Every structure is written in C-alpha cells, then in structure tokens.
Design a protein around this nucleic acid. Structure first.
Ligand code: ADP
Ligand code: MG
Lengths: 93, 107, 95, 608, 90, 93, 107, 88, 98
DNA sequence: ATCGGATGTATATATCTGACACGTGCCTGGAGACTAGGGAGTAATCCCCTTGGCGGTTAAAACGCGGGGGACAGCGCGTACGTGCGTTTAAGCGGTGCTAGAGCTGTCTACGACCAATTGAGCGGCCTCGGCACCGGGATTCTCGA
DNA sequence: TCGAGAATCCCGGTGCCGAGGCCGCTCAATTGGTCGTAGACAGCTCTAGCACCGCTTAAACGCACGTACGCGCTGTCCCCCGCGTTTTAACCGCCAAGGGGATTACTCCCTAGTCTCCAGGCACGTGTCAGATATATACATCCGAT
C-alpha cells in the first residue's frame, strides 16, 4: 500500500545544502517524524488562532503568526523571511 | 496548457499540493486559503535545511559521509535554538552529549 | 592498581560516547509483559513497541540520573544516595 | 458648657425622615411667594408620591446688618455686609444658599461672620461642621482664631490614634464649637460625625460635590442636619446635571428628582424652549445663588501691569530645535494624509516646548560631566539670559519675584542658577509636603526675611494661598487654560496688596511658543463676550476647526526658519519692541479677530 | 522429599534490572560514586514510569478493537504523557 | 450580546448537591473555566482518537475512551459509569 | 407535538443541545454521533458535582455558606485525586495549602 | 545648596522590593533567607514576564488590535502549560 | 531589658500568616510599570486592559511562590536552613527552565 | 618533584556485507477551466473603557544596630564502596510446530446533515436583603529570660 | 527555673453589596427526506505467541583489601534576623478626553466543488561503497618509588 512521507523532499534539501553527503534510514525516519511534528504544531496553533478570532479560514497570515509563536528567536525570524519570500514569488506568477 | 506544480511556481522543494490537502482534510478550519500551503511548505523546508546542515557538519566532524541519528542528536543539542524547539523530544539512538562535572575530575 | 575513581571517569567517558541500549533485552521485555498483565489479560506486543518502550525508559532514567548527580553535588558530595532521587523527582513534579 | 452641649449635640432621638408638612410646606409657600414658577415639580412628585400628595393637599388653600458687626474683629466690605445680610435673610426663611463669589473675595470671612451672627445674636452655638480640602484647613482655623477670637474650633488631623483621641475626648464629649475635617477625614470618620445632630454643614470649594453619585456625596446624604452653606468660588458650569446635584444637596425637598427636572427644563422638543426658559432658570436661581464679581465691587487695587517679553531663541537653542525637527519633520510637514496620531502631535509639541523652555531638559545637552554651575547655561538660553538681567534689575531696585513654571525640572534649573546667583528662594511644587509647604510659605510671608525670590508651579500653586508681599509675577511660560495662569498671577493680586501688580510673560519669538498667546487670547477673548451678552461677532465658530490640524498649524510657526537655517540682551529695547507688538496683537484681536482668528490657515513648511 | 512440581523459582521480574545495568545508566548520566541503596529506588522509579505509559498505550489499543499493542500506540501514549519520541514512525 | 455560559447549570447542580449553600461570582467564573477546559481536553482527545482510527465521527465510544485517558483512576471509573447510565436512559427514552 | 429537551430525556442537568452545537462547530470532526453530547454532558455533570461537594464541605469547615475560590483551591489540593487533574492549573485567588517543613520547627 | 540636580531614577525591576520577595518566600514556606537571593529573584521574574508578554503581544497583533485583553494573556499562559482559571 | 523574640520565631509566625491568606503579595503599580516597560520592546504604543495586568500578576506570583517552595527543599537537602542563589539555580535547572 | 613502567587509547590498514541511492511503470491525486455563493474586506457609527493626570492617608519600605546562631573549614575515624580476580549464570542466537491477529477488498441500511417553522429555554436587566466583611473588647495561649 | 508580655481565637454588634429572584425577547426541537458512513462480509499474507531444545560467550555474582570519603564534633566568625525610626509612594477617590473595540451593511472575489486530464511520487527491484571489524603500533596517562 501507499504510505506517503517527506522522504524525497528532505533528500532534495540535503543534496542542496551538503551536495556530497548521504543519510541513513533511521535518520530519515527521524527527519520525517520531525517534519510531521512541526507541521502539526503550526497547523494546530493556526487553527486555534482562527477559532479565537471567529474565522472559518486559514490563510498565510495565520501561518505566519503561528510560526512566530512556536519557533524561538532567530529560527522564527529567518523562517518568516523565507515564507514571505516564497509566497510573494508564488503570487507574482 | 502544460501543468506546473505549485511548488515550482513558488520556487520551493517541498510539496505544496500535499500540504494543501493535509490542511484541508485535517480538520483544522472550514476553508483553507491559497497562500497557506505555500507559506507552510517554505517554513518546513527552511527548518529541515537548517537541521540537516548542522547534522552534516557534525557527520563530517567524524570523518563520515552519512548522517546517523547520533549526528542529529549532536546538532540538535549543540545549538541553543533547536535545543529549545526540541526540548521535550527524545531522539531514538541519539545517546548523550559528552559532559562530566568539573568537581569530579581528579586533582 | 588504579586509585579509586580512575576507572570511574574512564567508564563515564566510555558511556557518554556510545549510543546503544544499556539495559538487556529479555529482562526488560519480561517486565513489560508482566506489568501489562494486570490492565488487560491476553495482550500481545509488537517488537517495535517494546523497543520504543525501552528507548523511552532509558532516556528517562539517564535524565533522572543527571538531575540526581546535580543534587548530590549540591550537597557537597560525589556519592549519590536515594535522598537525591527523591528530591529530583519531587522537584520535577512527578511526586 | 459641656453639659448643655452634650444635651443638645448628641442624637438623643434616632429616626429616619421626620417632617411631614411644616418645613416642606413652609419652604414651598415661601418660594411660591418669591416668584413661584416651580409648580411642575410640586404636582409631579405629589402625583408620584402619596406623602407629598397629602403635603400638596394643604397647598390648595393655606438684625439686618446695617454695618459691620461689632464682635468680629475689624470691618467688612460693603458687598461682604450685603452677603452676610443675604445669609441671615435666608436663615430667617429657613432655606439655604450657595455663596459663589469670584475667587479671592474673602468668602471664608463671610462664612465666619455668618457663624458669628449664629452664635452671638440668635444664640445657637450648635455643632457646626466645615468640610474643606486639606490645604485649606489651616487657613480656616487661623481665620476662626483671627476674627471671632473665642471659639472652640479644632482641626481633625493625625493618624488613627490621635484622631480617636480627639474624637472620644472632645467630639463625643461635646466639648467643642466647630469641627474641621478634609474630604477624606469626613469619609473615614463616618460614624462619629453621623451620631451628631448637625446644626449646619459647610463646604469650601463645593466642586467636589458636582457628581451626585460620588462617595463623598453618598456619605454626606445621611448626615442628619437642617441647613447647609455650600461655597463655590468658580462660575457654575452651563451643564445642568451638576446644578441639579448641588441644589439637591441644598434642598432635597424641592429638587428631589433628576429626570423630571430635565424633562421640564432641558430635554425639550425644540431648543428654543430651553433658550426661552433660560430666563426662568435665571429667575429660579436668583434667590439662592448669591454671587459677586471682583471687577464690579472692588477697585480697591491697582488693576494690573500686564507686560510681555518676546525673547529670542539662542544658537544652541536653535541647534536642539533643529535636532527635534529633524527627528520629527515628517508628522508636521503636512502629514501622511492626516494619518499622524494625535498623541504623536502632542508629543512633538511637548518636545518643542521643552526645547524652547531650556535646552538642558534633554539629556546629553549639558557639556561633559562632571558639571559646574556657572553662566554657561544662562547663555545657553536666551530666556534665561533675559530673566537673569531682569532679576539683576528688579532685585537691586527693590521687589520680590514669583516665577511660575509649568514643570518641575525647569524650577530645578532655576533653583540651581539662583543659588549660583546667591538669592534666597522657596519652592512650593506639588512634591513639598504639608508642614513643609506651610513652613516655606510662612517663612516667606513672615516679617522682614532674607527669602527674596519665591518659585512655584501653576497647578500646585494657585490653591488657597496668600503670597501677597511680592508684586512681579513673571511667568516662564503659559498653558492652554488661561484661568490657571490668571489664578497664578492673582496669587499676588488680591485683597491687601498695596502696590501695583506687575506681570511679565516670556515668549520665544519665531517658535511654537509665540503662537501660544494668540491661540490663548483667541480662547481668552471669546469667553468674556459670552459672559456679558452671550453673543458677539464670533463667526469663528470653528474653534480652530480641529486639533490634529490646529496643533499642526501651531507647530509650523518657526517651521521654515530654523529648518532651513556675547550677544547681550539690552532689556529695554526688548521691552519696547515686545510691548508695541503686544498692543498690536491686542488691537488685532479687539476687532473680534475679524481678519484671521484661525481660518484654518496653514500649509506644509517642513519640506526638507 | 518430593513436592517439586510447584514452581517456587523465578525471582521477581524487576530484579532483572541488575545492579551493573543501573551502574551503566548512572555512568551515562555522568555519576562517579554510587550508594548501595540506589538500586531499589531506581527499580521503583522505573516501575512507576512503565506502569503509567503502558496503561495509556493499552487504553489506546483496546479502543481500536485490537488485542495487540503496536508501536504507534506507545508513541501516542508517550506524546500524551508529554515525552515525544522520534524514530518509530509517527 | 449573546454570551452563553454554564453558570445556570452549575447552579442547578450545586443546589442539587448542597441544597443551601451559595457561590460567589468569581468561583462561578472559575467553575466555568473548569468546565470549558475539561470539555476542550475531552473533545480534542476524542478528535485525535477518531483521526488515529480513520473514522470521521465522534461517537460515545470516543468520549468514553478520552475519559479513560484524561481522568485519573477512581474519577475515570465513576465518570464512565455516569456516562453510560445517562446514555442508556436517553436511548431507551 | 410538545417539545422535550434532550437534557430532560437523558435525566441530566447540563445542556445537551449546546454541547451538540459546540461539538459540531469546533472542527472536532466532520460528523457527531447522536449519543456523544449526552455522554459528554453526563461526564461534565459528574465532575462538577464532585468538585462542588468537596468545595461545600470545605466551606462548612470554614464556617461559611458560600463557595469562594479559596475553597475550590482547598478542595482540589487536599483531594489527592483531582489534584492530578488540575496539576498545571493555577486558580486565581487560591493561596496555598498550609505546610511547614518539620526541619524548620523549633526544638 | 551645593547638591546639583541629578534626577536619577530606579530601574523598574527594583520596584520588586526586597520585602515583596520576602513575602513570596514566606508563602513558599522558607524560613531563613540569604542576602544575595533578591537579585536572582529579580532576574527570574523578568525572564518569565518577557516570555509571556511576547506571546500576548503576538496574539494581539494578529487580531489587528492595539489593546492587550485578558484573553490574550490567558491564551499566552495556556500556550506555555500554565493554564489560568478565573478570567475566561 | 526589652522583649526580643529569638531568631526564627517571627519568621515562623509570618509563614503561618501568609500560607493562610489569598491576597496578592507584590504591589500593583510597580508590577504594572514593569509589565509596560517589558512590553515596550515588542510593539510600540500598546494599550493594556486591567484584567490583563491582573492575570499577569496572578500567574507571576504563583510562579515565584512555587519556585521558592522548591528552593526550600534544595536548601534543606544540603543540611542548611538558608536559601542561596545556588539553590534557585539548581531548582530551575532541574525543572527544565534553564 | 621526577622518572620509568605498565596499561589504555588513538591511528592506520585490509575485508566485507548490507543498506542506500538509483532507475522503471503506473496510477492516483494535483493541476487547469469553470460556476455560483457566501465570507470577509472596507466604510461608517457608537460608546465603552483606557489613558493620563491630580492630591491625601497610611502602610510599607528603607536604614542602621546589636548579637547570637548558623555556615563553613578542619580533624579524626570508621565504614562502605571501589578495584580486581575468580566463578557462575543467563542473555542472545538458532531452530521447531501450529494458529490466530491484523491488515487489504464490496453491499447493504440506518443514522447524521439540511431545510422549514415555531415556541420556549436561556440571556439580560433590575431589585432586594442575608452573608460577609468590619471593629471592638475578652479570655487563651505561647514564648522567653529570670 | 514560672510569671510577663505579646499574639490569637472568640464572641457581639454594624454596615454594606452581591447573589439570588423575577420578568421579557429569541435557536433547539419537530417533520420530512435522503445520501454517504460504516458495519458486515468474504479473501490473503505477514507477525506474535507458547511449550521446548542446544550452544557461545560475555556479564553478572561474589569476595577480600584497603582507602578515601561520609559523617560527626569543635571552633569561629560574620551574616542574617528582629526591631525601632524615618521616608516614600501605593492605593484610592477623581475628573476629562479621545482612541478603538465592537457592530452593521454591501458587495465582490476567492474558496468550494465538479469535470477533465496528466505527470509526480510511490512501490519494486538492484548494484557498489561506507562504515564496522579485527590487527598491530605509537603514544599518552596514571602511578608508585626515589
Ligand atoms: N474684610 C477683610 N479684611 C481683611 N482681610 C480680608 C477681608 N476679606 C477678605 N480678606 C482676606 O482675603 C483673603 C481671601 O481668602 P479666601 O476667602 O480663602 O479666598 P477665596 O475667597 O478665594 O476662598 C483671606 O486671606 C482674607 O484674609
Ligand atoms: Mg477658598
């Protein structure tokens, strides 16, 4: 059966950052679990953010607020920068 | 017209369609915007790149060309930010960061 | 001979560097099964379930022993005593 | 007599409401005799209340003080004798009043004269209570000790222990004549004063009662008594609700409702109804709102010497002004579509005012630390240089100065520089606690003393104070309400002054400071026209038409000059030039400001 | 001298956490000298922790009609306890 | 405007148990927060229980299991008994 | 026909229509069974009654006839069982339990 | 008169006066107190407050408000596992 | 020879009077000033409610009270009856707040 | 102190073996076009409630003192734990035998969502008096030098 | 060393204000319909489990010496406590102004939803190199005798 996961995307990012480094299987499972955990945290916090303000819609503004709430300091700053960049590029297309 | 993925149209590597589908059929809100999958994918990609770069540094520090869970552990625990984001998290087969108290060292 | 304490620090260096499991396998699986025997009889376990249990258990005990060591040092000692375990768990809210 | 005082003072009988017909009916018929246009209330409450219904059921068919009293020390002003006659007459008719002379008219002496009548003529040395603000307690007690020398009048001060001591010893012992107590001491000592059958309750500065639901009003409602003598120097606000509250306290029989009073007078279908019933308001308030004005009674004094200085703005003053403007040009170079926050406007204005006042109010402006006091800062400020020469003119010729600042640090700087000039001073800023405030003021106003100059702030200065031994009242600056400044300069201009009151006013030319006075005068001048005839050629109904734009125009006075770009004073030429320009602006505003009062005439001048 | 059919053997299961294994855990925690009474206290602490986690995991697994505790059940139980665990899926 | 709360029902229960006691406003607000908190805990755990099992419906079984998970020991036992008793009485009526 | 509240049918005191609505409009799931509101109302019922009778006991032990936050604090803290449930909860105006370490007491 | 105007003002953390820490310690059941402990208290309080207020202000930003309501603070606390009962 | 209570007596009387009450222990205006100053570093020009600051004070005081209660155990464990900065550091380090 | 010795550890090398990084087909879910509808964006009102300043009363905070009791350093002593060697035991590995448990695929039907209409449970406002929060005087108790 | 002084619990009367009671506007409950969902079904393939048995090998068990450390005792000294005085700023009562929180209306555009279409990602199978392992050497540290 099909059990989809964030394996190929993680490997794509890896071969982008350290072009000549591999990664074992258990490490990949840990990375996949990490991505799922972070996705769940951000999505849950954004869901509560929409519910607090009586909105039925999740937008990019909710995601940005959630990532500022979860991530600490420098991580939050740089991730907000990256997300703004990607959404701007997507709109201008 | 020839189809183009939303990931490429945004310039990311993570899948924007899959993130959209999960946000929708995950019971988070009634309606899902159009920029939310893009933003979320970009943020996840950034975090993955950060942790993976640190782990690769650590792996090269042991003359190895693969990232094993010990290197993920070392990278996470030696960085003060990822050590806060993953403070309550246990990494299987990660081991312990080397540390012995100075009071215990012999005279 | 090695003066007392010489082998201990070397032993600590050995173990703060490896990653494998420190508790044996069967002595822990037996414990898990007979400790779940009472919540529900006629239970089965996947092997990876028991492995996850052991991973979590050893992580918990290692963190507890680090806190215990800090407690013992704070009392001007180098020997850990059950006093220290009790204090650490009381501080961490578990008791 | 402690025995008779004990017999009379204490609430021997405990009861709630006592009168049924006598007092209420007599008050009503007397008021009906004196232009009884007040039926609406009477039948409204009679219909809605059975008790006053049967009260109305009977309503269908049913020493004049020719001179100052001998006993009180000294004499009284003719208007004072008229006021005491007024109060005596109101007493004879068993209805109260509201003495409301303009401030500084010695109304306290009138109250003490009334009480002297009460004790010495009709012989009721009953328990009189005189609420007041704390600052005014000592002055009261001194007046009792000065005019009617033999009265057991005692303040109610001190911590709980000595308060309880006085209570249980004299008060509950009924061994006094009158009691004095602040607002808070009234609130704290509810029960001891409650268990006294109050002959009178007197209140100085009754504004504090203007709210009907205030806790002090709540408490004062159930003080059993018979007659009240509220006092309020300031004019009564044209709002009607507080007038209802005051009258309600005075005469609960009559003004016993709010909604009925409103529906009768104010809330009308057409506004001309209340415009015409203004005359009936005046009629109803005439009998019991006695008021005199210092202008039309007393000329007992040289009027004023209102002089004005248009000082310059110094080089380092310009430097820090430019610093501020460079920091705050955007919000005043027009605006960003008038999106600038009003708070930002007021803060820019405040920073400009601090720069104009003295460019040491900002840190890092004084030369390198540690500091030394010298003339360096008297020539860092054109204002301070002009003041320095003016002081070294006035002190030597013989005078005493009363500078009023607007903020404390400016008085700190003046203190330090005066100690450099080695003149004895006193500061009475709000920080100075009592028995230290009193210490300083009675040190100054003592007989011949070394304290020459005497420095205050306006908000904490003009409150029941009698600094009259000085004449010149130079102000460092001015505020938005001209009444506060007027009270400040009348700290010295009052009864007893024997020399002309000279008024100086520092104004920084080519600054936001210069626009203040004309903005003040526009506010100032229009007020009087309402007082006399209630209308004029006041076509400038805009009242600056805004505040976000009014203060925007306010800032831009010296906008383009400083932004784009020994030195002795020689005071006499500044006197001449500023007095000529002052009479010029007086003439300009005299013709209703017809040319341009505000006309919302401004444009961006902080371009770049 | 019979009656050997009765088990009368197999000491308690918590004694399978032997003295040197606890020493190994202590050393990985960075502990030089160990008292003699730490062993029993450690056994008690471990037993409490296991009881809590296993109770929650068995709850999860019998909700879903199954009679076999799978790794996902343990992971969920740990997450619910406040101790996220990475690696065994999830 | 419409601001629903459990003050009325908390009062009903209180008069049921201690017939002649009262409750001040602050305690009532605390009890309201308590009820909402427990409701969110139970509902969120039941939502996760349904999601884990691929179901799409929150039934009585999910609420019962979330009660077992959240409440400790003796409370869990009694509260489960209460819930089943009420649901059978409702269903039979 | 004359209506009958589901609260009356179930025999409970908490609302069941309100609980049903909050379950339906809280994104907890796509569909809500018919018996879930009843069960959840019963559980909230039971917990509220438990804590309130403990608080009333404490109020009498303090010789007052009206629960205040301090009494709720005493009921939850003294009771060993609810204390685990509200472990991370801070109750406003609760104070703490009286407790002095015996080592500090005089000899 | 030789004392020049200085106008030095205390840090706001010094408004957590020594007796207040003593009272908090007493309610903690602490008998004898050191003298170096007040700076540690003033230092841990500030950390706690910054971590809470940051999230409260974030929640306020999101709603496009300029008022930090009590519900924002309750949300911020609950986010850190410090649930507060009595304000909503 | 005036009356002096021997050391430790008044400090137990105070423990008893503060463990049997509920009011807030810190002043209110100093705490409010601290709150506004800390918040100034995140958004400029913020308005606060009143229940917001009260909630902050409740959470703050509960936090400190529990922290001191753990510091006491740490101090007693070292066979002292005096709490020193090392005790708070140990307590916070163990709780995971380091 | 210093020096040799004996042990433990880091370093370089050859070997393997098994997991990782690759390519291939294909099928499902992500993308492209299109329609209809309702959520939310924007504007405009409104009045609540925050802010910002003032002055007073009084409790709390700050300061300096005197003194003794607790923290800390030093000494001694006995014990209990560490180090090392010999011995025994249990873990781990492999192999047996069978069977259920658990995860993949279609048809039913009964139960939960939707829409209409309607009333009546619940929310809000407003009162009023009983519990509670003061305030004082009295007996009880508890601490501390004689 | 028990009597003195200070702190506490208890009762009695007072005042006040907050909770509980009562009255008047609105969505849960009634019907009717009807469609997916989720129980039931068969089939199919990989894991667990429960009694064994044989074998290798390291780890656990036990023991004796000794040592250094835990623990108790003593001293000492200085820091923290209780306390009385003086100062300060918090709380409270207050007033005045205006930002902005909350609500209402319209409209329009963006999201859901349907159909069609196609290509990206997933399972399957696969070949080789990264790292683990076992040796031998160099050398780094600890330890005791001098
Ligand atoms: N007849 C008089 N003789 C002497 N001094 C008087 C006389 N009337 C008033 N004063 C003085 O005028 C001053 C006015 O004081 P006060 O009545 O407190 O001001 P206000 O009337 O504004 O309250 C008093 O100090 C009083 O001594
Ligand atoms: Mg006056």
């Amino acid at each position: 059966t099909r059990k989809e996961s964030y394996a190929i995307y993680v490997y794509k990012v890896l071969k982008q950052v350290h072009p000549d480094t591999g990664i074992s299987s258990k490490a990949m499972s840990i990375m996949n679990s990490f991505v799922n955990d972070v996705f769940e945290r951000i999505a849950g916090e954004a869901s509560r953010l929409a519910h607090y303000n009586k909105r039925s819609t999740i937008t990019s503004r909710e995601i940005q607020t959630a990532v500022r709430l979860l991530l600490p300091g420098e991580l939050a700053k740089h991730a907000v920068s990256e997300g703004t960049k990607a959404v701007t590029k997507y709109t201008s297309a | 017209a020839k189809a183009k993925t939303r990931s490429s149209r945004a310039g990311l590597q993570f899948p924007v369609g899959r993130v959209h589908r999960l946000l929708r059929k995950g019971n988070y809100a009634e309606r899902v915007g159009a920029g939310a999958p893009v933003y979320l994918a970009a943020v996840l990609e950034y975090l993955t790149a950060e942790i993976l770069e640190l782990a690769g540094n650590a792996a090269r520090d042991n003359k190895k060309t693969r990232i094993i869970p010990r290197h993920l552990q070392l990278a996470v625990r030696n960085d003060e930010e990822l050590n806060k984001l993953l403070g309550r998290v246990t990494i299987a087969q990660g081991g312990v960061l080397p540390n012995i108290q100075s009071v215990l060292l012999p005279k | 001979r090695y003066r007392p304490g010489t082998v201990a620090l070397r032993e600590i260096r050995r173990y703060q560097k490896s990653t494998e499991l420190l508790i044996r396998k069967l002595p822990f699986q037996r414990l898990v099964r007979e400790i779940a025997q009472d919540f529900k009889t006629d239970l089965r376990f996947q092997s990876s379930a028991v492995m996850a249990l052991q991973e979590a258990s050893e992580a918990y005990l290692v963190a507890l022993f680090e806190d215990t060591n800090l407690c013992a040092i704070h009392a001007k000692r180098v020997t850990i005593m059950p006093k220290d375990i009790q204090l650490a768990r009381r501080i961490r809210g578990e008791r | 007599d402690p025995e008779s005082n004990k017999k009379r003072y204490l609430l021997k009988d405990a009861n709630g409401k006592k009168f049924d017909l006598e007092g209420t009916t007599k008050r009503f018929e007397h008021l009906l005799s004196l232009s009884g246009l007040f039926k609406h209330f009477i039948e409204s409450k009679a219909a809605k209340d059975p008790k006053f219904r049967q009260v109305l059921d009977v309503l269908e068919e049913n020493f004049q003080f020719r001179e100052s009293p001998a006993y009180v020390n000294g004499q009284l002003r003719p208007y004072q004798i008229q006021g005491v006659n007024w109060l005596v007459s109101l007493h004879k008719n068993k209805i109260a009043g509201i003495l409301a002379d303009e401030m500084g008219l010695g109304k306290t002496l009138q109250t003490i004269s009334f009480l002297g009548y009460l004790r010495y003529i009709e012989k009721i040395p009953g328990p009189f209570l005189v609420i007041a603000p704390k600052s005014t307690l000592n002055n009261w007690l001194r007046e009792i000790n000065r005019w009617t020398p033999d009265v057991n009048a005692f303040i109610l001060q001190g911590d709980k222990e000595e308060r309880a001591e006085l209570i249980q010893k004299k008060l509950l012992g009924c061994d006094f004549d009158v009691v004095i107590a602040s607002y808070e001491i009234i609130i704290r000592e509810k029960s001891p004063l409650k268990k006294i059958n109050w002959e009178y309750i007197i209140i100085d500065e009754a504004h504090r009662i203007k709210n009907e639901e205030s806790m002090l009003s709540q408490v004062l409602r159930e003080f059993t008594s018979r007659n009240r003598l509220l006092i309020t120097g300031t004019p009564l606000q044209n709002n009607l609700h507080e007038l209802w509250a005051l009258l309600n306290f005075l005469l609960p029989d009559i003004f016993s409702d709010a909604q009925d009073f409103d529906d009768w007078f104010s809330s009308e279908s057409t506004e001309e109804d209340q415009d015409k019933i203004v005359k009936q308001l005046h009629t109803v308030l005439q009998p019991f709102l006695l008021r005199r004005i210092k202008s039309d009674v007393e000329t007992s004094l040289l009027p004023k010497k209102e002089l004005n200085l248009y000082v310059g703005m110094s080089s380092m003053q310009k430097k820090w002004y430019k610093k501020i403007l460079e920091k705050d040009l955007d919000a005043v170079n027009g605006s960003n579509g008038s999106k600038e926050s009003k708070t930002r406007l007021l803060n820019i204005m405040m920073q400009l005012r601090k720069c104009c006042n003295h460019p040491y109010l900002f840190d890092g402006a004084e030369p390198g630390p540690p500091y030394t006091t010298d003339e360096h800062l008297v020539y860092n400020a054109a204002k301070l240089q002009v003041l320095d020469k003016l002081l070294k003119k006035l002190k030597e010729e013989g005078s005493r100065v009363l500078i009023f600042s607007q903020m404390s640090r400016l008085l700190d700087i003046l203190e330090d520089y005066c100690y450099f000039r080695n003149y004895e001073y006193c500061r009475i800023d709000g920080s100075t606690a009592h028995e230290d405030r009193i210490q300083a003021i009675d040190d100054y106003n003592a007989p011949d003393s070394k304290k020459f100059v005497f420095l205050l702030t306006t908000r904490a200065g003009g409150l029941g104070i009698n600094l009259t031994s000085a004449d010149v009242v130079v102000l460092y600056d001015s505020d938005w309400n001209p009444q506060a400044d007027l009270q400040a300069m009348d700290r010295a201009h009052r009864i007893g002054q024997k020399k002309q009151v000279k008024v100086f006013r520092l104004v920084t030319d080519n600054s936001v400071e210069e626009k203040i006075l004309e903005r003040a005068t526009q506010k100032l001048r229009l007020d009087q026209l309402v007082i006399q005839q209630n209308r004029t050629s006041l076509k400038k109904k805009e009242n600056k038409a805004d505040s976000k734009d009014a203060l925007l125009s306010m800032i831009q006075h010296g906008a383009a000059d400083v932004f784009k770009s020994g030195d002795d004073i020689d005071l006499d030429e500044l006197l001449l030039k500023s007095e000529n320009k002052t009479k010029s602006l007086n003439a300009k505003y005299e013709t209703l400001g017809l040319d341009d009062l505000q006309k919302f005439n401004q444009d961006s001048a902080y371009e770049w | 001298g019979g009656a050997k059919r009765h088990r009368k053997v197999l000491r308690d299961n918590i004694q399978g956490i032997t003295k040197p294994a606890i020493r190994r855990l202590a050393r990985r925690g960075g502990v030089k000298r160990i008292s003699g009474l730490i062993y029993e206290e450690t056994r008690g602490v471990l037993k409490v922790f296991l009881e809590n986690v296993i109770r929650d995991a068995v709850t999860y697994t019998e909700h879903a009609k199954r009679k076999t505790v799978t790794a996902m059940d343990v992971v969920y139980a740990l997450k619910r306890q406040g101790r996220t665990l990475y690696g065994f899926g999830g």
